[PDB]
């Protein structure tokens, strides 16, 4: 297929092939539904690059073209906040494939958690990740952009250099714009409005950020359900039954809850609603997660208490009142 | 397995025969699988009928198409003309077990299946004419101004018979479709049925669907594709053998002209390097105007005269106009001598 160039519509990567007189192809570094990602060396710019090779099929081409529209929209902004987003350098067609040339980055935050052996990084590293993520989300919310990532998780946050704390966001392939889909985020990081089948905005990315930051300090996912009903039950364990004004507006409300004769809501093997406290998940007064941080600097009771506040503000059930990226950057945790 | 073990590791719904949905649809069997997902035969207990339910794969590429398809079809359902009887009926749509489902009427077989029963030798000129009139009416309805839909994937697979014993047809795949003034894509049709304006990277409109009709009407009578190219350059080259070098005013304004052509030392346009000469594969011969029809197989049959075949050539050559400005339009095509 494609004159012996395509397999499943994918290009048959030849380690050592040269494209134009410019790109030298090293190896395949990723496979997806879109197609493939290879590592390459660009000779005109003397640098290593990552090339996303999209399948030779129009549905996947047309998704990727939307992806270039948002990546270029973001490029045309002069702010420096755009540096927390992975950089699109150029794109071209080659042997009937759309190819998107990106910068090369090091590991993801899931990789980092593997190296802690799922015991977590420190509150001081966490604060550094938290700040950059809040600034990236402030960039994505500028009115002319208005982008919802939709797939925020530790695999999709990449370290720039393996010896430093700079991070970047990647895979805008599940992205939409305000205005532009019901079964959307990844289960562990999926927001309540999404589980309940309600309209969503850029607030769903801030629910995920809170789930992600707690996992980076403890090593383990905050809410790990095997289905939606398990996911919603494990959220109620920590935050209690949701406000009654959100449930009364919620299509899929009765898959999880029931209304009592007094008109309050109730659930329908789990700890009682609200009894799994983030105060003890984080070890606020008990020396941190599993007491592993006792005596460590920057890890005081005053510190954990501030971290708790910010997270609870990110895990607000009401997408209208949940903390917005600017004010989160102003929170005392960051002082 | 995901979605509570209702989705496979391709994000497709694990169909089980016999299953009941919302106390209404008894799922009988799978009648179609694809990239987009699946199609199932199902008995609607409320309405007392069979239906075809298309369950979309839980991937965004495919969900985007289905949302376009739902919007454009729902738009058509508001129109009172009986012309919309040539478009496949969208009964309704919903969300079941975290999947988008579009519920259609159940139809029969497609015009490619019909060609495979002829052993790719063709149907008669009399049947082609019936198929042709219906398709032109379909294209007339789609160009009404409030609608202005381009199908963008017209081919024999996407035209379906209502009953297997009858000549009635409907069009079925609107998920690669767009509206005039909401055009965003440039690689848009199936190679074999793709218009020259699309091959050349130029602007396009509802005329591209007529190019396709011409390519399909000739295939229904001969049994074989007219322009069966392996890539975009073999595709253009196959078109050039039958129709010749495109006009100059067109090629001069065409962004992708130099992917196919180049100028000679006198300035005139010509191909760049197996293929017959331009214009030397003649539709007059492909159809057999004078030689008994395609491969002489219609010699002596009724309605297959030299004058019938001359009228058929005229209409096809009007659908295969290079210039989409002067290519024939559904209303004036319904008025050709072919139909009288």
Swiss-Prot record, chain B:
Annotated positions of the Phosphoserine modification: 176
Tissue expression pattern: Detected in brain (at protein level). Expressed in a variety of embryonic and adult tissues. Expressed abundantly in neurons of the brain, spinal cord, and retina in developing embryos. Expressed in the entorhinal, temporal and visual cortices and the hippocampus of the brain where is colocalizes with SEPTIN4. Expressed and extensively colocalizes with SEPTIN4 in apical dendrites of pyramidal cells. Also expressed in Purkinje cells in the cerebellum in postnatal day 1 and adult mice.
- The record lists ATP as bound by 31-39, 54, 104-107
Q: Outline the segment boundaries, as ranges, of region: Disordered.
A: 274-302
Description of how the protein assembles with itself and partners: Interacts with RANBP9. Interacts with RAD54L2/ARIP4. Interacts with WDR68. Interacts with CRY2. Interacts with SIRT1.
Give the protein family. Belongs to the protein kinase superfamily. CMGC Ser/Thr protein kinase family. MNB/DYRK subfamily.
Q: What is this protein called?
A: Dual specificity tyrosine-phosphorylation-regulated kinase 1A
Q: What is the scientific name of the source organism?
A: Mus musculus (Mouse)
Gene designation: Dyrk1a
Q: Which residues of the full protein are shown?
A: 135 to 480 of 763
């Amino acid at each position: 297929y494609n004159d012996g160039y395509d397999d499943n519509y994918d290009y048959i990567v030849k380690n050592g092939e040269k494209w134009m007189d410019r790109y030298e192809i090293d190896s395949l570094i990723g496979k997806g539904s879109f197609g493939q990602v290879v590592k390459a060396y660009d000779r005109v710019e003397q640098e290593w690059v990552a090339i996303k090779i999209i399948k030779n099929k129009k549905a996947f081409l047309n998704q990727a073209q939307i992806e270039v529209r948002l990546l270029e929209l973001m490029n045309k902004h002069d702010t420096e906040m755009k540096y927390y987003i992975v950089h699109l350098k150029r794109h071209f067609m080659f042997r009937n494939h759309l190819c998107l040339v990106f910068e090369m980055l090091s590991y993801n935050l899931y990789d980092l958690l593997r190296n802690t052996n799922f015991r977590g990084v420190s509150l001081n590293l966490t604060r550094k990740f938290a700040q950059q993520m809040c600034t990236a989300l402030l960039f994505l919310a500028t009115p002319e952009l208005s982008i919802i990532h939709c797939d925020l998780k530790p695999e999709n946050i990449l370290l720039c250099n393996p010896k430093r704390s700079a991070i970047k966001i990647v895979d805008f392939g599940s992205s939409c714009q305000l205005g532009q889909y019901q079964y959307i985020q990844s289960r562990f990081y999926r927001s309540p409005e999404v589980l309940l089948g309600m309209p969503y905005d850029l607030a769903i990315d801030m629910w995920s950020l809170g789930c992600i930051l707690v996992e980076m300090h403890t090593g383990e996912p905050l809410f790990s359900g095997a289905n939606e009903v398990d996911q919603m039950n494990k959220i109620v364990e920590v935050l209690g039954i949701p406000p009654a004004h959100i449930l009364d507006q919620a299509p899929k409300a009765r898959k999880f809850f029931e209304k009592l004769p007094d008109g309050t809501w109730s659930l329908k093997e789990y700890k009682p609603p609200g009894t799994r406290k983030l105060h003890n998940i984080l070890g606020v007064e008990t020396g941190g997660p599993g007491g592993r941080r006792a005596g460590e600097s920057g890890h005081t009771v005053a510190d954990y208490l501030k971290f708790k506040d910010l997270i609870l503000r990110m895990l607000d059930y009401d997408p209208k009142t949940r903390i917005q990226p600017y004010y989160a950057l102003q929170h005392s945790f960051f002082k």
